């Protein structure tokens, strides 16, 4: 529905969602946006209530600004928070290699304090990181990608703690103010007070409490019952806040004349210093959140308060003791209890500006924390709002930040969603964040909540799962890093047709209704009783009659990627998420196809590619051609909207962007306009709805073995091309520099008879390996040779030159046609790194025509190598001739799970083949229901279904029974799954019926050349001359130690030894036997651990002398 270019992949909606697809993607941006704070977002936020939100900026400004000296006589302030505007299709930078950005102006204002005066100055600030419609930032035509680090909400937090000693429940809580130090109270073993602050032994609190002014009375009074503390007033022995205080204070420093400071100053400072003591408003906010506190209090500050301090303290006491709720004076009550890290309300998440903002923050700070410095020194008088500016270091970082911004991580432009996934991708680790070398599984741990939060399934994978992820599906997330699941907030067998974005918490209080659930068409789930998670998410049954809220659909904590394959309910999650991640590693070959089957996700998902040239106006078409297309913006109005092609990925792939229609036709904004990449008929082309079947065969689909057609070739089905950029600079240095001529020493002809006038050939030109390349050259040196030579040269007049004959030449597995020409000169002004005056970068096609053996696959994780190629003929094949797509061993699924593969595929041939319900007279019962409408399948046509919703077996099965028998109204197929092809070879019948079908799959960014290597020899650590592994190099595989042990298990000695010597780095035998070799002869028998020799020396060295004899 709601789809301009809509077809219909007819699905199986047994259900309904009034709700509809959010926009995801939005995300950050918005932030950014908000961070910015556009009168957009401004409007945005602005709407949906929202008092006085603020572009993540200001703030900045005001969180410091305005300004002033320490002399209290020069007053600066700010203003004009804002920017200018970019200067490119970005696309420009893209090509133009720089990054995309737009200038910043802002208008602070200094003011004397003496006279007090005026120094505004709408100062420029910075051209700036300018996002993308992809909501992104492709530094210098080059973007990484940032995800947010999950972050359990900071704050003073609570628990019981037992002591096997006595087992007593020394509960407690910390304090953790942003940037504010620490200080914590803790159910003492023996009486009483988990006093000490951010690591200071312990005290009698009140010494601090009283220390601020507290008659031991006042407490006991308000705090005698409240007896354990009474002990505190006991052992507290010492008195006089001050007496303490100062004494404390020593407890602080320690050792120092307790000046009144000791009596207060820093103390307050310490944590009454929003000057520096600076928790988090949201926390701040929290806080109240903690405890129905001031609450009625649109507040904001680091305003520490002994007030609440003690408050929650006696909270402690009251609890350790067991006590439900209770209301502090005024402060409405709170049911007592510890806390949790685990749950997610415990647990916010970060976001750009936020970051940024932090970054930046110090940035100014920094750069800021200077004018101060200078402010002063910067004599009064003529010292303009300018005079003292220099954000430079800011962007320096900032800018920089990206450099280092390890979390910005180059968008794997391998497929769309893949890139997506990358988007929504989410963890909580790294810079300042965790260091997996320190985190208990729990980190990875499951837990209830979780639903409607992030794909249960997917995750990292190596030592990595339970560490990272994304969102679930819908539920937006807090203006403060917390999900926003709306719900079927039910009402009296009549759910309240109503979103309710929810932070798990709260909520937690509430009643877990069930999607997939039969209402009396009214909310009135027709049963009296139901189930539902409870306090512990206690997925508990119950009488329908009682919940507050149901849900928002089925399937939600899901991921998109998650959201992708049915039969789940039959299939290994392991295997699953496996396929999940898998999913991505398709490889947009060429053909473009969609599984005739597949849910709705799909392009409606894919649309969220938001990539395809896609309508902008109900305009009629206009001129068209594969670069763009003029667009009759029917307001007269037009715009030859463009279209890209032949431009590499992060992974070597075109810019292709295939059209749709006709320069004359007529259509309307937002509707499609032209695919391109992973973009089958407006849709991730992703595989091949492909026959094949069931046998494990002649041992070739065995142990992962895999048996594969061939026609394929021919068919071509399997290829695209791939892209290196091809670079090689012209440099500058000692003996001269790095020329790029075309002349060359005793170079072959043609070898040159090929390049351009002065080096490399010309675009779209074919090659191979070795193939020389550049037109480079460099001075050689100056250190004589043997007369012998020269002489020799005199002998052959080959009057040698003297220049470091230098250039480039094609390595291995390499060919195609000329492309790149990023020949960019320093000298030609083309800014570039030192000692260089230019550089080109180039590209070449190569259509990868799919080797067998390799690996592909599709849904049901159901990965699959690519064993053998196999000619057509020679092939089991329709009794109607037509043979397989390939075949399939058995076995795994059993010990695996994923049989939908089976079903789905049944299905496959089905759809692929269509049918019609011959319900006629009446009803296929199992029919008697369901998307009726179908009734049939026009042999082969569009077919989707819901996730946790779709027809059934029997049905499905019975669907089997159903049919669109072929030409000869035939169905070699059995209402059964197993027919009986014969042999494209020997040919005869088979033993028994033949299970078979079809399956779209996908193809792999992982094969030989990805990893096709060894190494005969090459470079060698100018230090530990080991195989200098490298590009030019094959690396030359390293070796293991066990291994060695293996030897041992034999003792080939030598062998190993040898190694150690040889290929290890036997300078000699390397040379030496290398010779031998060269001379092929009873090899220079293994010598001596040489070096080892060193040792000795090495020893001696320390008076160490000794010896064997």
């Amino acid at each position: 529905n709601s789809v301009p270019g809509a077809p219909n992949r007819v699905s199986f909606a047994k259900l309904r969602e009034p709700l509809e697809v959010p926009g995801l993607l939005d995300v950050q941006t918005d932030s950014f946006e908000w961070l910015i704070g556009s009168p957009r977002w401004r409007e945005s936020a602005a709407e949906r209530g929202d008092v006085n939100p603020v572009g993540g900026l200001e703030e900045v400004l005001y969180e410091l600004s305005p300004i002033e000296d320490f002399s209290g006589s020069m007053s600066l302030s700010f203003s004009d928070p804002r920017f200018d505007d970019v200067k490119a299709p970005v696309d420009e930078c893209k090509d133009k290699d720089m990054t995309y950005a737009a200038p910043l102006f802002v208008t602070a204002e200094f003011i004397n304090n003496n006279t007090g005066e005026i120094k505004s100055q709408t100062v420029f600030m910075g051209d700036f990181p300018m996002m993308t419609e992809k909501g992104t930032f492709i530094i210098n035509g080059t973007e990484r990608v940032v995800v947010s680090q999950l972050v359990r909400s900071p704050g003073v937090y609570f628990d019981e703690t037992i002591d096997k000693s006595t087992d007593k429940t020394l509960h407690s809580v910390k304090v953790i103010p942003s940037r504010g130090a620490w200080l914590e109270f803790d159910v003492d073993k023996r009486d009483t007070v988990g006093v000490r602050i951010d690591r200071k032994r312990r005290q009698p609190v009140t010494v601090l409490l009283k220390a601020l002014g507290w008659t031991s009375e006042q407490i006991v009074e308000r705090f005698g019952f409240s007896e354990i503390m009474r002990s505190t007033l006991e052992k507290d022995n010492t008195v006089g806040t001050d007496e303490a205080l100062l004494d404390i204070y020593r407890k602080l420093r320690p050792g120092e004349p307790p000046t009144k400071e000791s009596a207060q100053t820093l103390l307050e400072n310490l944590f009454f210093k929003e000057k520096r003591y600076d928790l988090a408003r949201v926390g701040r906010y929290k806080v109240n959140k903690k405890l129905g506190l001031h609450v009625g209090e649109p507040i904001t500050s680091s305003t520490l308060t002994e007030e609440d301090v003690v408050a929650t303290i006696e909270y402690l006491v009251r609890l350790h003791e067991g006590q439900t709720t209770m209301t502090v004076p005024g402060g409405v009550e709170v049911p007592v209890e510890t806390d949790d890290i685990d749950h997610f309300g415990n647990r916010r998440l970060r976001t750009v500006g936020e970051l940024i903002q932090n970054q930046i923050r110090v940035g100014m700070s920094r750069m800021e924390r200077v004018v101060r410095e200078r402010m002063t020194t910067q004599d009064v008088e003529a010292i303009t709002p300018q005079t003292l500016i220099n954000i430079r270091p800011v962007v320096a970082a900032i800018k920089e930040f990206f450099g280092t911004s390890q979390l910005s991580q180059f968008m794997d432009q391998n497929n769309p969603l893949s890139g997506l996934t990358h988007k929504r991708r989410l963890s909580a680790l790294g810079p300042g964040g965790l260091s997996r070398e320190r985190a208990g599984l729990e980190v990875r741990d499951v837990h209830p909540s979780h639903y409607g939060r992030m794909c249960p399934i997917e995750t990292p994978e190596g030592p990595n799962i339970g560490l990272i992820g994304s969102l679930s599906v819908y539920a937006r997330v807090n203006p403060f890093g917390f999900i926003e699941t709306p719900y079927r907030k039910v009402v009296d067998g009549v759910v309240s047709d109503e979103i309710v974005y929810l932070t798990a918490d709260e909520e937690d209080r509430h009643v877990v209704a069930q999607a997939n659930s039969p209402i009396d068409a009214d909310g009135r789930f027709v049963e009296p009783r139901v189930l539902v998670r409870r306090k512990a998410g206690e997925v508990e049954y119950v009488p329908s009659s009682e919940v507050d809220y149901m849900d928002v659909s089925p399937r939600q904590m899901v991921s998109v990627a998650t959201a992708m394959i049915p039969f789940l309910e039959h299939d290994d999650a392991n295997r699953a998420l496996m396929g999940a991640n898998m999913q991505r590693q398709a490889v947009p070959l060429v053909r473009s196809e969609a599984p005739l089957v597949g849910t709705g996700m799909e392009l409606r998902a894919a649309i969220d590619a938001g990539d395809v040239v896609v309508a902008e106006e109900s305009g009629v078409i206009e001129e068209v051609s594969a670069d763009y297309i003029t667009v009759m913006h029917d307001n007269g109005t037009r715009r030859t909207y463009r279209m890209r092609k032949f431009a590499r990925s992060n992974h070597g792939t075109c810019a292709n962007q295939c059209p749709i229609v006709d320069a004359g036709d007529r259509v309307e904004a937002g509707q499609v306009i032209a695919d391109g990449p992973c973009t089958d008929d407006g849709e991730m082309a992703l595989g091949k709805n492909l026959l094949v079947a069931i046998m494990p065969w002649e041992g070739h689909n065995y142990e992962d073995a895999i048996i594969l057609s061939n026609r394929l070739v021919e068919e071509d089905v399997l290829t695209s091309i791939h892209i290196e950029e091809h670079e090689i600079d012209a440099r500058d240095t000692k003996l001269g520099a790095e020329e790029i001529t075309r002349d060359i020493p005793n170079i072959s002809d043609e070898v040159l008879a090929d390049l351009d006038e002065r080096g490399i050939v010309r675009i779209g030109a074919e090659v191979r390996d070795g193939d020389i390349l550049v037109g480079k050259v460099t001075p050689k040196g100056e250190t004589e040779l043997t007369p012998e030579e020269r002489l020799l040269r005199a002998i052959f007049g080959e009057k040698a030159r003297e220049v470091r004959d230098t250039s480039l030449k094609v390595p291995h597995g390499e060919s195609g046609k000329v492309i790149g020409i990023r020949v960019f000169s320093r000298e030609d002004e083309d800014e570039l790194p030192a000692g260089v005056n230019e550089l080109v970068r180039v590209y070449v096609a190569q259509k990868r025509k799919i080797s067998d053996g390799d690996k592909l696959a599709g849904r049901h994780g159901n990965k699959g190598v690519i064993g053998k190629i196999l000619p057509v003929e020679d092939m089991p094949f329709l009794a109607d001739g037509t043979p397989v797509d390939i075949i399939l061993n058995t076995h795994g699924v059993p010990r695996r799970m994923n049989i939908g593969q089976i079903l789905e595929t049944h299905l496959g041939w089905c759809a692929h083949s269509g049918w019609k319900v011959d319900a006629a007279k009446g009803v296929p019962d199992w029919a008697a229901r369901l998307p009726d409408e179908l009734l049939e399948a026009q042999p082969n046509a569009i077919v989707s279904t819901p996730v946790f919703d779709g027809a059934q077996e029997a049905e499905l099965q019975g669907l089997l029974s159903c049919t669109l028998p072929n030409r000869d109204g035939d169905v070699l197929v059995d209402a059964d799954g197993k027919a009986m092809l014969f042999d494209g070879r020997s040919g005869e019948p088979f033993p028994y019926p033949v299970t078979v079908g079809y399956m779209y799959i996908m193809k792999l960014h992982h094969l030989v050349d990805d990893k096709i290597h060894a190494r005969s020899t090459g470079p060698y650590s100018m230090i530990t001359q080991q195989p200098l592994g490298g590009k030019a190099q094959f690396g030359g595989q390293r070796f293991g130690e066990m291994e060695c042990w293996a030897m041992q298990a034999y003792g080939a000695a030598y062998t190993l030894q040898e190694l150690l010597t040889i290929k290890s780095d036997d300078t000699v035998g390397r040379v030496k036997v290398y010779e031998a070799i060269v001379k092929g002869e009873n090899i220079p028998e293994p010598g001596i651990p040489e070096s080892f020799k060193v040792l000795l020396k090495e020893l001696q060295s320390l008076c160490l002398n000794v010896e064997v004899l």
Binding site: N746, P787, E788, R790, L791, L792, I795, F796, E798
Partner: protein
């Protein structure tokens, strides 16, 4: 040295004097070039007499089979 001595071999593919003649012609023999009178000095003749036969036997070897016999040494 495959070269080198391989040469030396070639260095014998003709006559005699022409050695120190030429070996000396760059001290090749003794590792140090010289002068027509420097060497031929020994034979007592003329820088004339020297480089005459000299470059001549060059021609000898300037000949190709004189070469390819050591050409890949190129």
């Amino acid at each position: 040295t495959l070269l080198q001595d391989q040469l030396q071999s070639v260095l014998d593919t003709l006559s005699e004097r022409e050695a120190g003649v030429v070996r000396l012609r760059f001290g090749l023999t003794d590792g140090q070039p010289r002068t027509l009178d420097e060497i031929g000095q020994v034979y007592g003749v003329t820088r004339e007499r020297i480089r005459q036969i000299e470059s001549k036997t060059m021609s000898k070897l300037r000949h190709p089979s004189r070469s390819q016999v050591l050409r890949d040494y190129l």
